[PDB]
Backbone:
C-alpha cells in the first residue's frame, strides 16, 4: 500500500483504489495502473520533472529504502496477477530489487522529487509506474 500526496491530489495504484477514491475521482488509467482522487487537505510531496534513471524506493516487505538504477518509462509485458490479466503495461520502469505483492504503493524518488510508485516486480525485479509526465498534478 501507499500513495503520493501532492497539492489536493492522492495518487494510488488503480488496483488498490478505495471506494472513497472512486467517489472523488480525478483521473484513472488501467494501462498504467494509476488512479488519482481529490483530497480536502494539501499534501507535501513534490513531483520530479527530470529524466533521472537512478533513485531510491521504499520496500514495505523489508522496511527499507533501496538505491536503484531504473529503465526509461516503456511498454512492458506483465504476467497475470490477482488484479490484471497478463498484458502490456505502459509508462513502466524496471529495476533490480526485492519486491512482493503488497509493496505496491511505495515511492520511488530522485534528487528532484517523487518519480513514481511500485506497481509490479517478482524474482528480484521491481516495476514502477512513472508520474513525471503528469504535469497537471502541479496545479488546480
Ligand atoms: C511488487 C510486486 C511483486 C511481485 C509481483 C507483483 N505483481 C505481479 C502484482 O502483484 N501485480 C498486481 C497488479 C500489478 C500490475 N501493475 O499489473 C502486478 C508486484
Ligand atoms: Zn530527478
Residues:
Amino acid at each position: 500500500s501507499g500513495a503520493i500526496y501532492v497539492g489536493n491530489y492522492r495518487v494510488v495504484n488503480r488496483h488498490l483504489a478505495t471506494h472513497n477514491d472512486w467517489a472523488n475521482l480525478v483521473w484513472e488509467d488501467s494501462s498504467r495502473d494509476l488512479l488519482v482522487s481529490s483530497t480536502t487537505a494539501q499534501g507535501c510531496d513534490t513531483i520530479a520533472r527530470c529524466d533521472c534513471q537512478t533513485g531510491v524506493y521504499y520496500c514495505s516487505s523489508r522496511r527499507k529504502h533501496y538505491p536503484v538504477s531504473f529503465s526509461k518509462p516503456s511498454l512492458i509485458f506483465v504476467e497475470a496477477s490477482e488484479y490484471y490479466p497478463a498484458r502490456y503495461q505502459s509508462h513502466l520502469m524496471l529495476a533490480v530489487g526485492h519486491s512482493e505483492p503488497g509493496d505496491c504503493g511505495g515511492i520511488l524518488r530522485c534528487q528532484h522529487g517523487v518519480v513514481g510508485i511500485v506497481s509490479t516486480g517478482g524474482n528480484g525485479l521491481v516495476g514502477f509506474a512513472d508520474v513525471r509526465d503528469l504535469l497537471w498534478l502541479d496545479e488546480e
Q: What stands out?
A: The radius of gyration is 14 Å.
